[PDB]
Amino acid sequence: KLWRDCVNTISNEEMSNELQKTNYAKWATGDGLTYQKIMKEVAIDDETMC
């Protein structure tokens, strides 16, 4: 779907080469995978956090 999106977006009549942030593009680029930062006080209180 991403390859097809590329071939479609690169083939179109538009000036821009931008790609819409689709479900497949988001997965492919790996969207919002960063671990959420929390306070030291909560992290030290939490046991599962190692």
Binding site: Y35, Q36, K37, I38, V42, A43, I44, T48, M49, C50
Partner: protein, 750 residues
């Protein structure tokens, strides 16, 4: 199928001849990610691991856990050893004074006389320095200013006198103060009139607050070292930790290093502080003599050597003994001066970086654990590697989140003085009047020992003695990395010898690219690097001509300044294409304005602006070199000629180039990350000093060129000058009666 093997070149060409092909310097150097606490703690443990059989005591000053290996029991294994015996150092030092007559008192004099002339501003020319006030690394120039302003509150105005001696006298005295006050800017709201619905606006003004700390806290902060990890360190798999020093210690190191530097210059068997061709010239002659002096019908052997755990073993208390011996004839005030720097390193404290990051993979969360909160968490949540380290750190760990590191030289800084201790070993030359004669070279940790004897059986026995001699000074030779062979070829500080030092082009290869100062500067640097490599590092004219090609490529893409006739599309290239059409003398256009590249082997030494000046249009050269153009700014004497270069071996040395000051000689915007942090307040603080200095330079134009001298007020100077300027302009008749009275009126208020 024909299976190509690259090593098969070594069958035809010898390793040294084609050593350049054993250096992967087209590739990416190793960088560090996240924290360096695990690397620092490792160093902290390993430093004490080599000193654990010494004497452990508690500092009555700091209240820390200290370890003293010096004059400890001698080792019974090949494991690194800090157990250096004082007598064996003093003997080796004595042996140096015998071999080099009256060098110590001569070197002491030169340093002592220099110390008197040394100004306080000598501490500005440094890299990122630890600032005790804010407890973060900052530029040396600021880190100095923050200390001077802080010392003025606690009433220590030795800095004002101009000399470094009274400022150093203040630093050791500042330890005696019971409380040390320092400014800590804190924001305050303030209504200001505006054209709002409610005609006003709130602007958060900075206000300086007097914050105090106890006698003990300051003493520790003064002895504290801030730790990181060595980034871009070549030819290394795993990473290692380094440290930055405070403004207090930096004063005394400068003198002791300058002292050892004076000795090293005059010592024959030292690779420092000489460099470049001068270094080769020395080592060549040294090698020629050490070769041709050997007994006929014998064997001369060169040990291609290296010392492992250099900084981790060498003790400050040995370095203290070294200064006391060197300053024996010099007066008592200088003896005590040189004794401080080692005394500070002897009771130094290590800051353990950021800390450790803990994460739940399921929850997908993360959080940094500050160094003071390392034992807040049960050690079951840390991984095996860190768990073991943290337990071994425990008996050295302080509650504030630091480690007492009495042994070792975490940061280093003593390179010249550490070389001398190495030379002292090379000075002994024999033990027990045996049938061998050793003598080597020293570049801090790096060494190359020559041995002349009857047969090789004798040579190795002679090397075995050097190894056992170095153990008593605290120098551990690396059995792993070090190797031996019959004289003719050897390695010393990435310089390869084979009946003469062989060319190694790969070491200087990274420098050929765009250095990243600006368009006009980088062009000069680029060619100056090419022409200097043709000379020193043996680059043939074909490769040299290609190095010019490959530069203009990297230059044109980096600064997006391709030829005018070329139809490569880009925001800038659009105006470049118009300039090409507008301009008649297109050969006169610079490469940065989409002009042609006219450089070749011969004219590398001439600036681009000078080469083309005659070929330029009269309008274009006017624009390019407009005296009052907005791009260039207030040029500093260093800002025009000099610029930084980072070669993969030694410290960052600033080389000088030749370029004409034109529109292309611009500066880049400041890092704007500061705007979002609480550091904002420093922006105002800067622009305040900026006004004062810029107005002082308007009164005294020579201030930009040569450093202004005077212990009097900065206003007092500006007042008296502008008073005279007005008086003389009136009597000469440049100033009118209307303006003179107004001038004398305004100055009357001051």
């Amino acid at each position: 199928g024909m299976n190509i093997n690259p090593y098969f070149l070594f069958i035809d060409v010898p390793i040294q001849a084609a050593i350049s092909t054993t250096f992967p310097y087209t590739g990416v150097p190793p960088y560090s990610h996240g924290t360096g606490t695990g690397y620092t703690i490792d160093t902290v443990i390993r430093t004490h691991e080599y000193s654990n059989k010494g004497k452990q005591y508690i500092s009555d000053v700091t209240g820390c856990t200290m370890v003293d290996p010096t004059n400890g029991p001698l080792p019974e294994d090949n494991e690194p050893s800090a157990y250096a015996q004082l007598d064996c150092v003093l003997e080796a030092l004595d042996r140096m004074d015998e071999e080099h007559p009256g060098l110590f008192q001569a070197a002491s004099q030169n340093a002592m006389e220099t110390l008197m002339v040394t100004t306080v501003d000598k501490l500005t020319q440094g890299r990122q320095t630890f600032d005790w006030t804010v407890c973060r690394n900052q530029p040396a120039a600021t880190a100095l200013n923050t200390t001077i302003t802080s010392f003025r509150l606690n009433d220590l105005n030795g800095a004002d006198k101009g000399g470094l001696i009274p400022f150093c006298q203040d630093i050791i005295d500042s330890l005696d103060r019971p409380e040390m006050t320092f400014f800590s800017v804190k924001n305050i709201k303030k209504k200001l009139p505006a054209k709002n619905r409610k005609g006003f606006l709130i602007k958060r003004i900075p206000m300086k607050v007097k914050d105090k700390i106890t006698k003990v806290e300051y003493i520790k902060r003064a002895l504290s070292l801030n730790t990181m990890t060595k980034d871009a360190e070549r030819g290394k798999l795993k990473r290692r930790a380094i440290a930055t020093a405070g403004i207090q210690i930096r004063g005394f190191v400068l003198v002791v290093e300058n002292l050892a530097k004076n000795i090293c210059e005059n010592l024959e068997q030292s690779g420092l502080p000489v460099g470049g061709n001068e270094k080769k010239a020395k080592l060549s002659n040294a090698v020629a003599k050490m070769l041709s002096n050997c007994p006929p019908g014998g064997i001369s052997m060169t040990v291609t050597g290296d010392n492992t755990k250099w900084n981790e073993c060498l003790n400050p208390r040995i370095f203290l003994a070294m200064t006391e011996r060197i300053t024996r004839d010099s007066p008592i005030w200088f003896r005590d001066f040189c004794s401080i720097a080692p005394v500070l390193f002897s009771n130094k404290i290590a800051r353990l970086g950021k800390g450790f990051m803990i994460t739940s993979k399921t929850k997908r969360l993360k959080a940094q654990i500050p160094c003071p909160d390392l034992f807040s968490i049960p050690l079951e949540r840390y991984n095996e590697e860190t768990r073991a380290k943290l337990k071994k750190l425990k008996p050295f760990f302080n509650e504030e989140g630091t480690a007492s590191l009495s042994p070792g030289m975490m940061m280093g800084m003593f390179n010249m003085l550490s070389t001398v201790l190495g030379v002292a070993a090379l000075g002994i030359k024999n033990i027990g009047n045996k049938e061998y004669l050793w003598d080597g070279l020293q570049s801090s940790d790096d060494f190359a020992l020559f041995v002349n004897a009857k047969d090789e059986e004798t040579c190795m026995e002679g090397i075995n003695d050097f190894y056992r001699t170095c153990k008593l000074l605290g120098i551990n030779m690396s059995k792993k990395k070090s190797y031996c062979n019959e004289t003719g070829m050897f390695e010393f500080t990435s310089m390869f010898y084979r009946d003469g030092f062989v060319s190694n082009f790969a070491m200087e290869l990274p420098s050929f690219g765009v250095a990243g100062v600006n368009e006009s500067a980088d062009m000069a640097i680029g060619m100056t690097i090419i022409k200097n490599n043709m000379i020193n590092n043996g680059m043939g004219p074909a490769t040299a001509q290609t190095a010019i090609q490959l530069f203009i490529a990297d230059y044109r893409y980096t600064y997006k300044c391709h030829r005018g006739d070329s139809k490569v599309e880009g925001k800038r290239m659009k105006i470049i294409k118009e300039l090409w059409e507008n301009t008649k003398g297109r050969d006169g256009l610079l490469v940065a304005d989409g002009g042609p590249n006219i450089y070749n082997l011969r004219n590398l030494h001439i600036p681009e602006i000078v080469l083309k000046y005659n070929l330029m249009d009269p309008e274009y050269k006017g624009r390019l070199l407009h005296p009052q153009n907005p791009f260039v700014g207030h040029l500093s004497i260093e800002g025009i000629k000099e610029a930084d270069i980072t070669p993969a071996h030694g410290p960052v040395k600033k080389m000088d180039y030749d370029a004409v000051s034109g529109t292309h000689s611009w500066r880049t915007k400041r890092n704007r990350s500061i705007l979002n942090t609480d550091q904002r307040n420093m922006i105002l603080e800067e622009q305040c000093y900026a006004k004062c200095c810029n107005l002082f330079e308007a009164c005294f134009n020579s201030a930009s060129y040569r450093k202004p001298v005077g212990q009097h007020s900065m206003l007092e100077a500006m007042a008296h000058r502008l008073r005279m300027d007005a008086r003389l302009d009136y009597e000469s008749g440049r100033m009118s009666k209307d303006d003179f009275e107004k001038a004398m009126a305004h100055l009357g208020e001051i």
